[PDB]
Structures are given as structure tokens and as C-alpha cells.
Design a protein around this ligand. Sequence first.
Ligand SMILES: [K+]
Ligand SMILES: [K+]
Ligand SMILES: [K+]
Length: 261
Amino acid sequence: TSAVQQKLAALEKSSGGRLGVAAIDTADNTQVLYRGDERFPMCSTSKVMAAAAVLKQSETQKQLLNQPVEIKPADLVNYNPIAEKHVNGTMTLAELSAAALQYSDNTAMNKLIAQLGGPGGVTAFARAIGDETFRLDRTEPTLNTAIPGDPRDTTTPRAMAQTLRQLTLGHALGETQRAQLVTWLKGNTTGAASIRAGLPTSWTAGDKTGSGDYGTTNDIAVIWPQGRAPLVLVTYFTQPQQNAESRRDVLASAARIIAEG
Ligand SMILES: [K+]
Ligand SMILES: [K+]
Ligand SMILES: [K+]
């Protein structure tokens, strides 16, 4: 066990839950893993794969992001901070991608899934970029059940870290699309208490959070330190009690341990 792994194991022990971490240092492609091959519920971190899949489509469909999409009453689910502002109006796929990514809007996610022809369309994009691990099975809000041992709507930290790297730094997308995704992640509003809270303040980051039942608390990020090659960090966390509170502090502390090690 490495010194970082010992600190992560100690953090996990202190927490009562199950922690998964994958970090990639793009300098020497060094990676640090903790439970890196275990499945975790993705919850809203799956919105990155759905938005990226739509971005991939827009590479050949040049007008796709400006395409208006109707928001109807029946579309509303459990958490719709942006979509509920536009009921009986429209939102563009760009606006829906932004809402999904920067506000974790679940109605917006469902519109991306529908654009892609169902959850199978999101999973197919994962496979098309070499991710054999990601699986999206359900729409919002049922994808957040986060039931212990259920493989539905899960991935591993190792897989999501590699995917996130390919999407935001490594040309799985076109350049206009990659920059748009980087811009979206940087502008996230839901991440201040998660990975970002554990990083040196001179570092810049983009991220996508997730949360669900079993106190599931997740964050995935791409990170730019100054005069150092960028990093990719995934932190997944879930707990034994179905009704457990969120533990964003665990993700912040994991990021601190990675940043230092
Ligand atoms: K978010
Ligand atoms: K959400
Ligand atoms: K909460």
C-alpha cells in the first residue's frame, strides 16, 4: 500500500462508508487508485457521458445544439431547477446540456437521454470511446436508487477517470466540442463543497457532482494546477444506510490527499 492509499483507507475507515478514488497524473500517466475497480452508483455524474454523447452527435449535426426542445409539465421529475423555469416553452440542447451539467437538472438529463434514443444510446457512446465499464440502465430519477450491489447505473473509478480524461483533455470529441465540455465543467455551480474544497486555491477545476440514496456522494473533475500537467480525479462514496446524509467532506478530503500525494 502506498502512503496515499493508507491515508485514503484511513479516511474511509473514519467515514463509516465505502470510498472509491481514481487519479491520473497526465505528466507520466501515473495513476493512484483506491477501490478503483469496484462498482459505484454514478448518480448525476452520468450526465457527463450523456452531454458528451450529444456533443459527439453535433460533430456531424452542425445545428444540433440550437435545436429547440419542448418542456412539458409531464417531463418534470424530482429535481428540475432550470427546466421548471421553461415549462410550456422550449430549451435548446446546449441550454439543456448546460442545465444538466452546471445545475444537475434531472429533466435536462432525460432530454439528453431521449435525444440519444434511450439509456442504451448513452451506454453505446461509452463503448464507442473505449469505456467497457460504464452502464446506464434507467432514466431520472430511478437511476439514483444506489442499491448496494446493484450493477445498474454504475461505473468504476478507474473507468470514469480514463473516460473523463479522454473527453476533456484527449480528443474523444472534436475540438469545438471538447472546449465546450471543459467550459461547462468549469462553470459548475454544485461542486464547491466537494473536490474543489480540497484543492489548493491556485488550481483551476471543472467538475460534475452526484448524489443519491445510501448517502451516495460523488464528484468527477479535471484539474489544472499552475506549472504542472493537469490531473483527472474521480471520487465516489456510498454508505450502508439507505437514508444516510450526504458526505461531500469525504470527497474534499480525498482530493486534498491526492493533491498532496
Ligand atoms: K453539477
Ligand atoms: K441531480
Ligand atoms: K443534502
